[PDB]
Amino acid sequence: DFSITQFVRNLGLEHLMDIFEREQITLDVLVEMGHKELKEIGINAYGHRHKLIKGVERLISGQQGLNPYLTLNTSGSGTILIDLSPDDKEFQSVEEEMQSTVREHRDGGHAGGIFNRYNILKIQKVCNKKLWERYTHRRKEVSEENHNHANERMLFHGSPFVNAIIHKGFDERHAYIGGMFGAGIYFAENSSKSNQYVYGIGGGTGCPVHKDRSCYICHRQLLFCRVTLGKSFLQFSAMKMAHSPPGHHSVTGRPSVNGLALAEYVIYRGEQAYPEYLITYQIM
Amino acid sequence: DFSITQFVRNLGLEHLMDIFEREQITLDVLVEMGHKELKEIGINAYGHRHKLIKGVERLISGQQGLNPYLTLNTSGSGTILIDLSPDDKEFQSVEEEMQSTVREHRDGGHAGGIFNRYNILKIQKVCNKKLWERYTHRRKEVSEENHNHANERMLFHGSPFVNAIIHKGFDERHAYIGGMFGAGIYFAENSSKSNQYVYGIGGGTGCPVHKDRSCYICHRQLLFCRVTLGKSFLQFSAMKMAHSPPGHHSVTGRPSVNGLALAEYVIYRGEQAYPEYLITYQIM
Ligand SMILES: COc1cc(-c2ccccc2)ncc1C(=O)Nc1ccc2c(=O)nc(-c3ccc(C(C)(C)O)cc3)[nH]c2c1
Ligand SMILES: COc1cc(-c2ccccc2)ncc1C(=O)Nc1ccc2c(=O)nc(-c3ccc(C(C)(C)O)cc3)[nH]c2c1
């Protein structure tokens, strides 16, 4: 509580400290308080409130280049997870999309295992204000370049680093370097294709307890994510590219003939995706 | 013009009418004025302003069941077209989308004519507040039923009733009853596919002047529209339906297995589309 103590002492208002001590007023709280709030906590003299407000203004605006406000506004930031009720239609819709997009793969379930259906344990909504704001800023920028259309989609993503993504967001500096379409971030319409990557490329070595890629006990996690494609380049063959083709904001391809197989997408900028839903499940 | 006069006379404030005559205050304008605005025009006495504001409150809220506000606020409604400059990148994006999706058709250009690309004369943004609000309300409804995803796309629409659509909106009561997917409103990713319907089903009789379906002279108009798909049912054969399949919000399919052909979509509720862009063009 020393920062507010110094601030109040510099104004000659140390005699008010008692109030600030009882009301748990820290400097970050104080810089958001006007005449009304200050009157609520017992600062009755107009001169004291005037001095406090003027000092806050001289700090936040007078030294804007030092960014004192950002230093004081780190509280409350971070991710929270909100559990969906299985009886609500949001949970049911997410589950229906998860289940209805399973299919057989070219390999006999070597990477993701053998299964026809999932057992969904829980689905969570990922809430992070800074990452959401970054995503929306990028979405606006892309829409302005694509005749007012973001071309937004919902796609699955499987990664052994789901926790890092949900806490720090998608990052093209951790792209899939060895991917068929180059160093980007990959998403799939089929949930099974993303499930093939839950433990790593080619399924890695399986679940950490069993070293089994087809384990039916160990809990898996997928992300159902908001992805901005904008103008998407249609790619028919493997091509290693570091960034999007000129004039485009993503790449879309299909590694299998027409049928039960759905499309797949690559974005080369981390701010074009947001991990909206975290799904915990088992394969049956 | 007499509504304001009766309203003011009923309050015993007819001596103010001269002011209201010089400032061109009508009842629709008056119902939106508070103490500040009335002070600006010269109603200095507090009592007069109080009486006027209470009269407006008694009319608007007191008789809400009669909806006088709707009667008064009809002015300003309607559609306006904002022309896009060819130098702007929005115009370039729309024209690129128009030009890049031309392709050959099963018929030798019988319905739409023989051409490789268009000559774009102008592109206009359609602005209508009521239709936009209807579309956004429906989009919210669909998003709440599809895990917070509207699945919104931008698709071409051709019709000989473009003016009716832009001034009244899309209407399933004017659906394409004979369409292969039933009585619905049809959109195409290929611009040339929608170009076949600008003069009617199968091209109709052609241009109104020369009655030529391959006319290179008469100006044609297309719509590039925001379409909410929600959970879309993938249809593989021709099946006539009146509404969406249960649990879905639209239908997607394509009659041609060729890779060049893009997808086509059908909606069965007019509020799920909005005609954002009107394109005037010729075939070359
Ligand atoms: C556009 O995608 C493809 C196209 C073609 C193609 C080839 C020829 C012609 C036409 C098309 N072939 C393969 C893919 C493909 O690999 N798709 C996916 C789909 C989902 C995920 C996924 O959920 N996760 C990771 C992931 C995530 C993290 C990591 C790290 C780097 C963390 O290990 C690696 C891969 N990759 C995917 C990759
Ligand atoms: C999903 O769409 C199809 C699917 C299949 C199919 C068949 C078998 C298997 C799988 C798929 N075959 C044909 C169509 C089709 O007709 N698509 C379109 C595409 C654009 C427009 C368009 O821009 N305009 C009008 C229009 C508009 C208005 C009117 C009026 C007002 C005259 O009624 C008539 C037609 N119809 C379209 C129709």
Ligand SMILES: [Zn+2]
């Ligand atoms: Zn295991």
Ligand SMILES: [Zn+2]
């Ligand atoms: Zn003509």
